Every structure is written in structure tokens, then in C-alpha cells.
Design a protein around this ligand. Sequence first.
Ligand code: NI
Lengths: 107, 107
Amino acid sequence: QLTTESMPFNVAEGKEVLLLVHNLPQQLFGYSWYKGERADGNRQIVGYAIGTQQATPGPANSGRETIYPNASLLIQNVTQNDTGFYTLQVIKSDLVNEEATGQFHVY
Amino acid sequence: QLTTESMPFNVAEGKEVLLLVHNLPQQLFGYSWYKGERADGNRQIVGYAIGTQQATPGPANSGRETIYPNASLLIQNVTQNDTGFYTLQVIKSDLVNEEATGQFHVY
Ligand code: NI
């Protein structure tokens, strides 16, 4: 069952958090992470295509995010404006896609 | 900008609606249609793979839906329950995606 987890859940301003991804299904084109609680293009952070290991930023990219081959997202030098929810969308090769929403709190 | 237009917007019960698609982006991998206002997997009608030309039903498929290679969706035998919003997500090859949401009303 596709989920995320925030490491740590409570993040000091300036510090870092890892959004870790469990249970990626088989046969993927790629990954798409978003800010907020849904897949929304205006709030896309990064697109990652797995056969080419190419990452492409979206409208919400700050420059402080790093996406990994297993879908995990590290954000560095966390700001109060990074607080709350994020969404991962996993794109399957039949286009029947899966989403996972997680969150952390900046203090 | 990606848009959809319902043809016709106003549908008699038991008739047909074509959700047309304007301004597809470049270099894409496939399409995803959903019931409602968001790209939620649990409300996915259909995923269409442009590469292979293959449509896979999602969970919200009723057997009345037909997707065309240009992303337009046909809903046949419409009921009073179908009035509302429908969302396409177009999955691009750099996985940085776009959505557009339209609607129809059944009398
Ligand atoms: Ni009415």
C-alpha cells in the first residue's frame, strides 16, 4: 500500500527532512511530487522519469529539494513556508496512477 | 493552456457527452481521466498509454466510457448521478504534468 513518511515529523527551521516512500508498485514511468494534498500541476515540485534518471522541476520547486531513484524527497534549509502537506504521485506504464500524501511541521 | 469543453454541456438523461480536449502539450506519455475535481486514483475512470495505444479502466470506470487518442472522453447513457466534474491529467515525458477539469449537467 503506497505511503510516505517524514523524517523527522517535526523539523527545526533551517534544518532538513526526508520524505521516504514505501511500497512503490512495479512497472513505473516515473514520479511526481507536489506541494499540498493533491496532484496539482501549479503546485508541482519535481517530475522524475526513472529510465533516464532525469529530474525536472515544476512551478513549486525552490531549489532546496532532492529527489532519489526510490522516490524519496529530501528538502534542505527548511522554511516555515515548506510546512504541511506533500503529495507523491507514482505514474505506472498503464497510466493507472497512485497517490500518497504525507506531512511535516516546521517550527 | 490545457482545457476541456463538454459537448454538449447540457445533456438529456440517457444521451451522450464528449469531453473534448484543447491544447495538449508536447511529448507526452499518456492520459488519465477522473471523476471529480482532482487526480485521485480511487476515482480514476481510465488510463491511456499513448506509446502502446492502450486504455486500462480504473476503479471509477462504469463501462460507458471511451477514450480517444487525442484525450477526448465519451460518456454514453448518462444518468442523473453523472452531473458534475471530470478531470484529465496529461502525463508528460519529463513527468511534469498538467490537469484540466470540466463538467456537464444532466436533465
Ligand atoms: Ni439540474
